[PDB]
Amino acid sequence: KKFKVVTTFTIIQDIAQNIAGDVAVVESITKPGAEIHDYQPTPRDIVKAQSADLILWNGMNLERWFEKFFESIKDVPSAVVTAGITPLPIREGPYSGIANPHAWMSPSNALIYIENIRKALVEHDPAHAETYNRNAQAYAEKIKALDAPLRERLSRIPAEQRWLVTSEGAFSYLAKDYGFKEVYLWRHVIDIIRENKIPVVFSESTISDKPAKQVSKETGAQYGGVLYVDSLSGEKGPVPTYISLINMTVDTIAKGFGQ
């Protein structure tokens, strides 16, 4: 029998499947592309999680539905994969002061995701500890190697122009790592764009693109479209892995800035 792991969403699924390798099967509760914050689980989502040996979740109140969901599950252990991360506060807007849950968009934070998943797997499936530890070591080397080329590419964007328009803080951890300022959009966004001649504006995927488009139209900044960071694609889609999500997000940002 294969140890069965269930995760709340696809980013954790991919990180955990690299650590589990061949000795455990990792499934996500939510399909690729699903809205993760207020997902509404079905009765069969609960039954699927009930068949697992371990449930992994992000915490930091990413999954507002998880506490109720988990209360419906009997005697399946869970582990929060962000234990030990320094949470960034949402700096402005209606959620000012609250922990920003999007911690996976910092590649350094992904090393802590890996460590917590490895620990939980080794705790609950000790027979396979050697495999989990080896796989976590090998995958962590891949993740450490992510940061250098991304940092170098984004560092060519002059610091004066290094701004991201944010609505729910989906990019705040990437912005912290690579030195981007953030201006919140619930217009005073227009002024900051014009003042610093920020060349491009992106939209978050959990909100309407209309206000970001209005900002672009009025300032003359290019509208670079939507940046999706809450989900992977399917296996055969263009964003099948956590590594591909990080690399593609930075490439889209950098290209928006002519870099």
Author numbering: 40 to 225, 239 to 311
Paper text:
Bacterial substrate-binding proteins (SBPs) belong to the widespread ABC superfamily and specifically have a role in sequestering various metabolites, including amino acids, nucleic acids, carbohydrates and metals. All SBPs follow an evolution­arily conserved c-clamp architecture containing α/β globular lobe domains connected by a backbone and interdomain β-strand hinges. Recently, we determined the crystal structure of holo YfeA, a Yersinia pestis polyspecific cluster A-I SBP, and reported a method for purifying apo YfeA in the presence of the Yfe transporter by fractionation, adding an additional strategy for the production of apo SBP proteins. In this report, we solved the crystal structure of apo YfeA as well as that of holo YfeA that was reconstituted by soaking crystals of apo YfeA with zinc.
A possible explanation for the improvement might be that gentle pipetting better preserved the sphero­plasts, reducing inadvertent rupture of the inner membrane and contamination of the periplasm with cytoplasmic contents, including metals that can reintegrate with a potentially apo YfeA. These changes enabled the purification and crystallization of seemingly apo YfeA protein exhibiting relatively low EDS signals [Fig. 1(a)]. Diffraction-quality apo native YfeA crystals were observed to crystallize in the orthorhombic space group P212121 and had unit-cell parameters a = 40, b = 52, c = 113 Å, which are 2 Å smaller in the a dimension than the unit-cell parameters of the His-tagged holo YfeA crystal form 1. Apo YfeA contains 111 disordered protein atoms in a mobile helix and a 94.0 Å2 metal-binding site. In the apo state, YfeA has three grouped (His76/His141/Asp282) site 1 metal-binding residues linked to a rigid amino-terminal domain lobe that serve as an electrostatic attractant for metal ions. A fourth, disengaged site 1 residue (Glu207) is linked to a flexible carboxy-terminal domain lobe containing 111 disordered protein atoms from a mobile helix.
